[PDB]
């Protein structure tokens, strides 16, 4: 399924080239521009753990998730991955723990040392 596919067939988008964050573009977005640091970004997401559990989804809450890009408000994999997206893009990300919650985890749904899968839609970005 999708998590296996992005594990095996995703592109490393890290600066380190340590395969910590892999990406597949699922729906090509609009034009060429990507957001800049500090922009307000609006995303829809779904997240799965490596054991198949769907641990979170913005769609189920009927509101997007909004954060300021590149400020460390979210896991490193999201700062990295959303910065590569166009408006209207849908991508899959596979996040090793170093770019997510590491050995700490995140109570209550994310265990220690968790590799995470996400599907992310970039709805909009504004300065």
């Amino acid at each position: 399924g999708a998590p296996a596919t992005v594990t095996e067939q995703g592109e490393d988008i890290t600066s380190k080239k340590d395969r910590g964050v892999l990406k597949i573009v699922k729906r090509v977005g609009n034009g060429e521009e990507t957001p800049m640091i500090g922009d307000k970004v609006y995303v829809h997401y779904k997240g799965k753990l490596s054991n198949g559990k769907k641990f979170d989804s913005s769609h189920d809450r009927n509101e997007p998730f909004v954060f300021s890009l590149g400020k460390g408000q979210v896991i490193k994999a999201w700062d990295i991955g959303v910065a590569t997206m166009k408006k209207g893009e849908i991508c899959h990300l596979l996040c090793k723990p170093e770019y997510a919650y590491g050995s700490a985890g995140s109570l209550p749904k994310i265990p220690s040392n968790a590799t995470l899968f996400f599907e992310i839609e970039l709805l909009d970005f504004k300065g």
Binding site: V74, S106, K109, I110
Partner: peptide
């Protein structure tokens, strides 16, 4: 608080 931090 995922999605924070």
């Amino acid at each position: 608080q995922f999605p924070f931090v």
